[PDB]
């Protein structure tokens, strides 16, 4: 009685948790790649 | 109900100071509707204009219903929220949706 | 009053519009 | 090697966890077992 | 790629042959299980009628 | 030797020193150029807590966030017993109460939550301005955030005071501010026919289209041997016009601001001056250019 | 192996027209570039142009038929004329009178052909220059939403009346009617997902534009050069977004974010609209059973009455 | 030469196909020939 | 020279065509001449 | 010179055409002259 | 030469086709000739 | 050569598929053959 | 610009004087036709009354 | 060679899968076979 | 292009001739099948009437 | 080689999982088996 | 490409011939199964009538 | 020295002003003192 | 050293002030003490 | 060392404070203790 129907479970909460987890993973990986070391212009002399 | 008041119909209710030449549907109230449109007095009003979740009708019937609803809005001047809760139109909450039923049957 | 406060809020609403017009003017003028 | 070991482990574990949660919720909301107050 | 037969050398590496074998075996097992399940379901309630 | 490029590619074989991210941060981190440093002569909080910069407006903002979250959770768990975030109902005081607040009567915690949220948003804007001043940058991000913050301010402060009842504010509940939106849109029937709402919708759609096109353009020339003119030739064959490297970002900024500005104007105008957007267009068929030119169902 | 000069100045079919470029002047001062340049016309873009012209001509002539061919009433009522699809009676049938939906079907078919040929033109022109084909797939997602709206929703419902009515005012009416006919469209979860992605797209566009314009003194707008060695402008932008919200991206990932936000918006919108009619007839009545609707026992109704 | 052969072929074929489709649709929607159920 | 010849000819021809079309539709729609079924 | 001859010509001609069309439409819609079926 | 031959040909052909189509539609929709079921 | 073989093949195949789908849909939707439950 | 009079030399080129003359003559003819038309229209039906 | 083998394989597989899905759904929704509860 | 006939040499490559032959054969087979289907459909229910 | 082994594996597995979910959902929603409370 | 026949050397590689053979065998099997399924469905309930 | 004298003075003054304002508004809005029209 | 003295002082003071304000407001709005007009 | 001491302290303290606040709110909103006016 107090429980939501199966449609309410899946169609509403599987996408919700998927969105939250995917956002939290994508942020971590993008920050990792952005903080990795690679070719940059030298800040001491470039400006 | 008595909360509406004890007001009663009389001669000045319809004629409004004009002997003959009374005109329903003037040009003023036909703003965003087709000028040939009239209230559809051929239907059964306790369930006549129901369109929500029917699956047997389409946007044509909804357009006719919207024309009727906007005429009701113009006649009262209180906007669409006077008889409806916009979160669910088929709901019976605001208590002027029943008086409108009595008005539809009387008309 | 009914109208004075409404006109003042209208003024406040247009003051929001102003800052982006400032950026447009700066971009237009500073090129030459 | 077509597939890393790590990607296989991650995909399989995620699929298993999601399926377990979905099956538990679908059985609970059915009201066909008399579990947790009918 | 000395483990792959002569015919399929132009298509397969030596590491993908074993994975392909595993996938083929899994597919055959799944097919047998599915056939048994369909037979049981038909014996339970026919769906064509 | 392999040089890892910023895109993540490695190529065999200019100031291309492969340097860590720490050096860049240490070079640019210098104290004493914020807004409060000019006013009081010193920023009381001029330090970094982890990666975040804590200025004079960071403490105010954090206090506002904490108080807003606490007051939100108190009304919805207590005083409502819902225990779920998707069915709680945080409403302002009734319209009969007027512009005055009362701790005893209901709707008091909505006031505190709204005030704390306003303080937090203003603090966030000022802190962005401070951080932009510390880096010798332009003031465009604060302009955009100020546009959206003015959009917030119009709905909860200016419109209720203009109407004069303080019950004219959308409730702070998930799946319930949608209820307020739906009931407000239909009270002034055909919110589609509001001229400024249509402009906002048009600018929103244009913003999405422009963002997707810019992403596609940049991603299509990522990791190939290109002469830097191929994308212009592509954008000139298709559509017969190329806007340039600096033009697109200006367009994105300007459109993103303008959409929300027009939307806030439309909502405010709908609140006070007009009562029916269908009657607004009644003047079109009456201008003295089309009055007597038709007959029957075709005349207006 | 790709010559940029011949790609811009060939003649005839598989060539360009308006070859001598024009200059607008004010666009140079405000946007940075004012050259209009030549335009490609070869093969693709001819079929699409012809079909779109045919569809527009059909729609405009049917507009003209509705007012008695009077050009003044035409100007008066031009913004509220529309060609509507066949009514609900014998809806899917093509044997409809020309004035009761006969003109709608032909125009819709020609529009379909036009959009498909435009996608083909985009794909071929992207391949012919050496750049990637991301724009074609983005347009494919947009066309997926379009084809769900115009072809696949009317079908599987049984009538052509479920589609829009080819008019300036007829699309807003379509949106309102579709929202009303299936309960409350706010409580459709995919509509919420699409709104999420659309607002995120606008927010991301505004942030990226503001950042690249703020750090424009050090030439951060040259994104192609920044993807090889990062100059001071990109470093300043990275530091700005690191100190404000604790994390940042580089000059390469943000475009991936924007692309995927737009694509997700389109895809989720299409899925929600398709499910709106065929599986769930009432979104509010479904939300009440899914426990996402808040109880509203005693509403204060004085706010919503004049 | 004022016009290529390919341009003429493309334009003529497209015009012919469009006119054929338009004529067939207009004759079908007229209901004056008793074709495809009257 | 203040104006190209081609610009003048194009403008004049377009204006003439538009005006002729407008005048024919206006005369047709007034119903004062008994042309094309009154 | 403050104004090009071309600019003045274009503005004056466009203004004349717009005013002429407007004045004929205003006179026609007023129904005061009995022209084109009263 | 003020005008190319190809531009003149294209403009004239397009104008003729558009005018013919418009005239056919207008005459059909007038209902005065008894063509295609009255 | 005026036209590639690939272009001709792709255009013809797309036109044929579109025409087949359109003809089937129009014939089915007419309800004059008694196919798939009349 | 040796055909332009002395007074208007700093404003007019030599090719624009002819176009100006044509425009002036056209405007004068239009004014004459307009005055005739207005007189005829007033004689038909006065619009002031 | 005008067409890649891989392109042909991809196009044919996609078309076949789409056609199979469409035909199954169209036959199921017609309610003319009494399959899956009539 | 030595397999192409003399008359179509300036138009056809050697690899495109075979594909063209395949297309022609497929088209003719489809035409035969279409004729048979049309005659069967007419024998079932005339559409012109 | 026209197709990598990894691409074939990924496509086949994704298609299989999507189909398995689709047919279980379609069989459940029909109510023709009396499983999980009829 | 020594395994491809002489006719189809300009069109086929040596690794694509085997894939095409697999595809043609799969298509033939699918066609046989489809014919049998259609015959069974017609025997069950005709759809033309 | 952990904290500048200026920072301490600024923080203390800001906190004092803000809290004095908050107490005055909260006491005024409570309506329990009969001040400024009850 | 893991944590600066200044960070600890700032965090502790902010937490204490927030808790004090929240507790005072919660006790005031409960109406369980009869303080400031009941 | 897999985990620095500072992050451990911060995470533990934040979790403890959040749990304390949540537990107090949940117990107060249950109305089963007669605390703060029942
Ligand atoms: C309606 C009447 C019946 C019913 C009728 C049937 C019938 C009939 C059948 C099934 C089948 C199955 N059903 Mg059922 N089913 C019922 C109720 C249930 C219930 C339940 C909650 O009661 C459950 C849990 C299931 C579950 C199952 C599965 C065991 C099985 C489908 C497997 C699958 O996904 O294949 C698709 C899966 C895949 C394509 C991939 C699976 C995962 C792989 C193995 C993992 C690889 C990992 C590795 C890292 C990947 C590398 C590549 C990556 C790209 C990186 N059924 C009811 C009672 N069910 C089928 C079966 O028996 O299958 C054997 C079947 O034919
Ligand atoms: C999520 C899945 C896990 C995993 C789970 C397992 C499991 C579980 C097993 C292996 C085993 C094997 N795995 Mg491992 N494995 C993973 C990742 C990998 C990777 C990799 C990513 O690089 C590789 C190279 C391997 C490779 C291998 C082999 C070394 C080894 C033997 C395979 C074999 O001979 O199969 C050939 C045989 C088959 C393919 C059997 C197929 C059977 C089919 C599915 C039918 C089953 C019928 C069923 C049991 C009956 C049901 C009755 C019911 C009551 C109705 N695995 C992932 C991460 N792996 C096996 C092993 O080591 O055994 C000693 C083993 O038991
Ligand atoms: C029936 C009585 C109607 C009426 C019906 C019309 C119609 C109908 C038309 C006019 C047009 C005009 N009317 Mg009248 N008109 C009326 C009353 C008036 C009154 C008045 C105060 O009473 C006035 C002042 C006018 C004034 C005018 C002029 C503006 C104009 C004719 C002159 C002109 O510019 O020729 C200059 C015209 C040309 C130089 C045309 C040259 C065309 C060449 C020969 C090519 C033609 C196309 C050709 C056949 C195409 C096929 C072959 C291919 C080219 C190869 N009308 C009444 C109300 N009038 C005509 C016009 O031109 O309007 C713009 C027009 O179409
Ligand atoms: C209401 C009672 C009367 C009436 C009352 C009047 C009165 C009174 C007058 C007119 C006038 C005119 N009327 Mg009237 N009118 C009536 C009904 C009609 C009917 C009709 C179908 O019945 C027609 C066709 C007309 C038409 C006309 C025009 C001949 C004329 C206005 C010309 C104009 O637009 O000037 C404005 C136009 C322009 C400024 C554009 C000129 C364009 C030039 C000539 C071409 C240049 C081309 C070249 C390329 C340009 C180069 C420069 C460019 C910038 C590149 N009338 C009724 C019957 N009409 C007026 C007149 O006599 O005018 C002379 C006038 O005063
Ligand atoms: C029930 C009677 C229905 C009907 C129901 C269906 C259904 C249902 C379908 C068709 C399909 C088709 N129908 Mg029929 N059809 C009817 C009447 C007709 C009429 C007619 C004029 O009356 C015609 C001309 C056709 C013609 C056709 C063909 C276009 C097609 C079958 C041939 C084919 O291409 O096989 C070629 C097919 C293949 C080569 C497929 C091979 C697939 C391989 C074997 C793999 C299958 C998947 C496998 C099990 C997956 C698991 C294993 C893992 C992959 C490892 N039908 C009536 C109205 N028809 C079928 C089709 O394929 O449509 C696209 C189809 O699905
Ligand atoms: C039932 C009677 C209906 C009707 C129903 C249909 C239907 C239904 C169709 C046609 C189609 C056509 N109709 Mg008929 N048609 C009718 C009356 C007419 C009249 C008339 C004046 O009366 C005319 C002139 C036509 C004329 C035509 C042709 C344009 C065309 C058939 C020939 C063709 O081009 O084949 C050329 C076509 C081919 C050579 C196809 C070759 C395909 C190959 C063999 C592969 C087939 C698919 C294959 C099985 C897929 C699976 C395997 C994988 C590919 C590996 N019809 C009446 C009203 N007609 C057909 C068509 O093609 O329209 C575009 C069509 O679909
Ligand atoms: C009316 C009775 C109200 C009430 C109304 C108020 C109001 C109103 C205020 C307080 C304030 C305070 N209340 Mg009391 N308060 C009540 C009951 C209580 C109870 C209780 C349990 O019953 C407690 C514990 C308190 C406790 C407190 C203190 C926190 C504080 C006063 C001391 C202080 O810090 O001074 C330290 C303050 C100073 C040293 C200020 C010195 C300022 C100098 C003199 C300059 C002043 C400005 C000057 C004139 C400007 C012009 C000249 C130019 C400067 C040249 N109140 C009741 C409910 N209370 C006051 C406060 O300061 O809050 C922060 C305040 O504003
Ligand atoms: C009235 C009875 C109410 C109630 C009302 C309140 C109120 C109201 C408050 C508390 C506060 C607290 N309550 Mg109690 N509380 C109740 C029941 C309880 C129960 C219980 C299980 O029954 C418990 C365990 C607690 C526990 C607590 C503590 C968390 C805290 C006091 C200790 C502390 O941290 O001191 C440490 C505090 C300090 C060291 C502060 C020192 C401040 C110094 C003296 C300066 C003050 C400002 C000064 C005047 C400013 C001007 C001068 C300038 C600075 C120069 N309360 C009941 C329901 N409780 C108080 C608190 O601090 O909450 C955070 C608070 O505000
Ligand atoms: C419903 C009937 C019973 C009941 C039945 C049960 C049953 C049955 C069980 C519990 C269990 C527990 N219950 Mg209970 N419970 C009831 C009512 C309560 C009430 C209450 C307010 O009424 C409370 C507060 C609790 C509290 C608790 C916990 C003590 C415990 C779950 C711990 C946990 O979170 O594990 C999950 C937590 C974690 C996985 C992480 C915990 C944090 C770690 C240790 C911190 C490390 C910090 C360090 C920095 C981390 C490094 C990594 C970082 C990422 C950097 N119960 C009622 C009365 N309860 C469970 C138990 O006993 O567990 C032992 C259990 O099985
Ligand atoms: C009061 C009881 C009452 C009177 C009295 C009354 C009179 C009346 C007359 C005399 C006419 C005809 C006059 C003429 O020749 O047309 C007339 C016509 C109409 N009425 Fe009436 N009427 C009275 C009551 C009402 C009421 C309450 C209504 C409204 C429901 C009503 C309406 C009308 C209408 C409509 C007409 C038609 C008149 C028209 O010009 O078309 N009357 N009434
Ligand atoms: Fe960019």
UniProtKB/TrEMBL annotation, chain B:
Residues that hold heme c 4 according to the record: 47-49, 51-52, 80, 83-84
Binding, heme b 10: 96, 99, 103
Binding of heme c 2, residues: 11, 14-15, 21-22
Residues annotated as binding heme b 7: 49, 52, 69, 80, 83-84
Highest taxon listed in the record's lineage: Bacteria
Residues that coordinate or bind heme b 5: 11, 14-15, 21-22
Residues reported to bind heme b 4: 11, 14-15, 21
Annotated residues for binding of heme b 11: 103
Chain residues that bind heme b 8: 48-49, 51-52, 69, 80, 84
Sequence positions that bind heme b 9: 48-49, 51-52, 69, 80, 83-84
Binding site for heme b 6: 11, 14-15, 21
Binding annotation for Ca(2+): 30, 33, 35
Name of the protein in its database record: Uncharacterized protein
Full protein stretch here: 161 to 267 of 320
From TrEMBL, chains D, H, I, J, K, L, N, P, R, S, T:
Residues involved in bacteriochlorophyll a 2 binding: 24
Binding site for bacteriochlorophyll a 4: 24, 35
InterPro entries: Antenna_alpha_CS, Light-harvesting_complex
Gene Ontology biological-process annotations: photosynthesis, light reaction
Subcellular location: Cell membrane
GO molecular function, one term: metal ion binding
Residues binding bacteriochlorophyll a 1: 24
Keyword Metal-binding listed: yes
Main location: membrane
GO cellular component, one term: plasma membrane
TM regions (residue ranges): 9-33
Residues the record lists as binding bacteriochlorophyll a 3: 24
Keyword tags: Antenna complex, Bacteriochlorophyll, Cell membrane, Chlorophyll, Chromophore, Light-harvesting polypeptide, Magnesium, Membrane, Metal-binding, Transmembrane, Transmembrane helix
Reported function: Antenna complexes are light-harvesting systems, which transfer the excitation energy to the reaction centers.
This protein's name: Alpha subunit of light-harvesting 1
Organism: Roseiflexus castenholzii
UniProtKB/TrEMBL annotation, chains E, M, O, Q:
Keywords carried by this UniProt record: Antenna complex, Bacteriochlorophyll, Cell membrane, Chlorophyll, Chromophore, Light-harvesting polypeptide, Magnesium, Membrane, Metal-binding, Transmembrane, Transmembrane helix
Residues that bind bacteriochlorophyll a 3: 38
Main location: membrane
Keyword Cell membrane in record: yes
Residues at which bacteriochlorophyll a 2 binds: 8, 20, 24
GO CC terms: plasma membrane; plasma membrane light-harvesting complex
Name of this protein: Beta subunit of light-harvesting 1
UniProt topology in membrane: Single-pass type II membrane protein
Family stated for the protein in its record: Belongs to the antenna complex beta subunit family.
SUPFAM superfamilies documented for this protein: Light-harvesting complex subunits (SSF56918)
Transmembrane intervals: 27-45
Binding residues annotated for bacteriochlorophyll a 1, in chain numbering: 8, 20
Residues of the Antenna complex alpha/beta subunit domain: 17-48
Functional summary from the UniProt entry: Antenna complexes are light-harvesting systems, which transfer the excitation energy to the reaction centers.
Subcellular localization(s) per the UniProt record: Cell membrane
Keyword Nucleotide-binding: no
Gene Ontology MF terms: bacteriochlorophyll binding; metal ion binding
Biological processes per GO annotation: photosynthesis, light reaction
InterPro entries associated with the record: Antenna_a/b, Antenna_beta_dom_sf, LHB-1/5, Light-harvesting_complex
From TrEMBL, chain F:
Residues bound to bacteriochlorophyll a 3: 197
Residues that coordinate or bind bacteriopheophytin a: 124, 128
Ligand binding (bacteriochlorophyll a 4): 197
Entry binding sites for bacteriochlorophyll a 2: 177
Binding positions for bacteriochlorophyll a 1 per the UniProt entry: 177
Record-listed Mn(2+) binding positions: 214, 249
Subcellular localization(s) per the UniProt record: Endomembrane system
Domain of life: Bacteria
Bilayer-spanning residue ranges: 52-74, 108-126, 138-158, 196-219, 251-273
Signal sequence range: none
Residues reported to bind Fe(3+): 214, 249
Annotated bacteriochlorophyll a 5 binding sites: 197, 266
Family the entry assigns: Belongs to the reaction center PufL/M/PsbA/D family.
Role noted for this protein: The reaction center is a membrane-bound complex that mediates the initial photochemical event in the electron transfer process of photosynthesis.
The protein's name in its UniProt record: Reaction center protein L chain
Origin species: Roseiflexus castenholzii (strain DSM 13941 / HLO8)
């Amino acid at each position: 009685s107090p429980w939501p129907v199966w449609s309410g479970y899946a169609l509403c909460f599987v996408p919700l948790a998927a969105v939250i987890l995917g956002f939290i993973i994508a942020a971590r990986f993008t920050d990792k790649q952005a903080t990795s070391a690679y070719l940059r212009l030298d800040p001491a002399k470039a400006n | 109900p008595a909360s509406v008041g004890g007001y009663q119909i009389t001669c000045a209710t319809c004629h409004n100071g004009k002997a003959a030449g009374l005109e329903p549907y003037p040009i003023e109230i036909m703003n965003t509707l087709p000028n040939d449109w009239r209230l559809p007095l051929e239907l059964d009003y306790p369930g006549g204009l129901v369109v929500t979740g029917r699956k047997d009708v389409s946007n044509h019937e909804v357009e006719q219903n919207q024309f009727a609803m906007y005429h009701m809005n113009v006649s009262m001047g209180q906007g669409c929220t006077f008889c409806h809760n916009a979160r669910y139109f088929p709901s019976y909450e605001i208590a002027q949706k029943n008086h409108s039923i009595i008005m539809l049957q009387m008309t | 009053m009914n109208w004075i406060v409404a006109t003042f809020m209208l003024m406040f609403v247009l003051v929001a519009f102003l800052p982006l017009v400032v950026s447009l003017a700066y971009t237009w003028v500073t090129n030459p | 090697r077509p597939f890393e070991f790590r990607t296989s482990v991650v995909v399989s574990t995620l699929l298993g966890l999601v399926m377990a949660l979905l099956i538990h919720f679908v059985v609970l909301s059915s009201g066909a077992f008399n579990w947790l107050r009918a | 790629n000395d483990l792959v037969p002569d015919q399929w050398k132009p298509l397969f590496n030596n590491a993908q042959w074993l994975v392909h074998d595993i996938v083929v075996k899994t597919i055959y097992g799944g097919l047998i299980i599915a056939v048994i399940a369909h037979v049981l379901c038909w014996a339970w309630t026919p769906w064509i009628r | 030797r392999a040089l890892p490029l910023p895109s993540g590619e490695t190529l065999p074989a200019a100031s291309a020193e492969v340097i860590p991210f720490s050096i860049i941060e240490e070079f640019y981190k210098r104290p004493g150029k914020t807004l409060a440093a000019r006013f009081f002569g010193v920023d009381p909080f001029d330090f970094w807590i982890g990666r975040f910069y804590v200025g004079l407006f960071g403490a105010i903002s954090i206090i506002g966030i904490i108080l807003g979250v606490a007051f939100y959770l108190y009304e919805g768990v207590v005083n409502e017993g819902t225990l779920n975030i998707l069915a709680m109902r945080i409403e302002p005081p009734p319209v009969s109460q007027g512009l005055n607040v009362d701790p005893a009567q209901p709707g008091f915690f909505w006031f505190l939550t709204m005030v704390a949220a306003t303080i937090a948003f203003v603090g966030w804007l000022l802190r962005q301005i401070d951080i932009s001043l510390k880096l010798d940058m332009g003031m465009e991000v604060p302009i955009a955030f100020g546009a959206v913050v003015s959009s917030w301010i119009t709905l909860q402060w200016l419109r209720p005071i203009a109407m004069g009842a303080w019950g004219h504010g959308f409730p702070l509940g998930i799946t319930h501010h949608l209820d307020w939106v739906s009931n407000i849109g239909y009270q002034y029937y055909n919110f589609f026919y509001n001229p400024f709402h249509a402009i906002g919708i048009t600018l929103l759609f244009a913003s999405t289209l422009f963002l997707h096109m810019h992403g596609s353009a940049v991603l299509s020339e990522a990791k190939r041997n290109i002469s830097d003119q191929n994308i212009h030739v592509f954008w000139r064959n298709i559509l017969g016009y190329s806007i340039g490297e600096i033009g697109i970002h200006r367009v994105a900024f300007w459109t993103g601001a303008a959409s929300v500005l027009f939307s806030n104007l439309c909502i405010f105008l709908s609140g006070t001056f007009v009562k029916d957007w269908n009657a607004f267009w009644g003047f079109w068929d009456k201008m003295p250019i089309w009055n007597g030119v038709g007959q029957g169902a075709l005349v207006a | 192996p790709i010559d940029l000069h011949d790609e811009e100045y060939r003649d005839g079919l598989e060539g360009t027209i308006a070859k001598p470029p024009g200059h607008v002047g004010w666009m140079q001062r405000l946007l940075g570039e004012g050259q209009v340049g030549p335009i490609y016309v070869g093969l693709w873009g001819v079929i699409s142009f012809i079909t779109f012209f045919a569809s527009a001509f059909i729609i405009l002539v049917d507009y003209g038929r509705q007012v008695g061919w009077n050009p003044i009433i035409y100007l008066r009522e031009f913004w509220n004329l529309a060609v509507y699809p066949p009514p609900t009676e014998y809806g899917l049938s093509w044997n409809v009178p020309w004035d009761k939906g006969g003109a709608w079907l032909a125009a819709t078919f020609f529009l379909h052909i036009s959009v498909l040929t435009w996608w083909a033109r985009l794909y071929t022109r992207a391949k012919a220059t050496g750049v990637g084909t991301q724009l074609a797939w983005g347009f494919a997602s947009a066309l997926s939403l379009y084809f769900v709206i115009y072809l696949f929703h009317p079908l599987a419902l049984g009538n052509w009346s479920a589609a829009p009515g080819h008019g300036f005012r007829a699309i807003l009416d379509w949106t309102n009617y579709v929202s009303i006919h299936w309960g409350n469209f706010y409580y459709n979860p995919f509509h919420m997902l699409s709104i999420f992605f659309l607002l995120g797209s606008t927010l991301l566009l505004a942030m990226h534009g503001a950042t690249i314009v703020a750090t424009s003194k050090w030439k951060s707008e040259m994104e192609f050069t920044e993807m090889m060695a990062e100059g001071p402008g990109t470093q300043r932008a990275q530091l700005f977004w690191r100190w404000v919200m604790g994390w940042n991206a580089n000059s390469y990932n943000i475009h991936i974010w924007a692309w995927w936000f737009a694509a997700f918006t389109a895809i989720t919108g299409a899925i929600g609209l398709f499910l709106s009619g065929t599986l769930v007839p009432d979104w509010y009545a479904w939300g009440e059973t899914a426990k996402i609707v808040a109880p509203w026992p005693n509403p204060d109704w004085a706010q919503y009455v004049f």
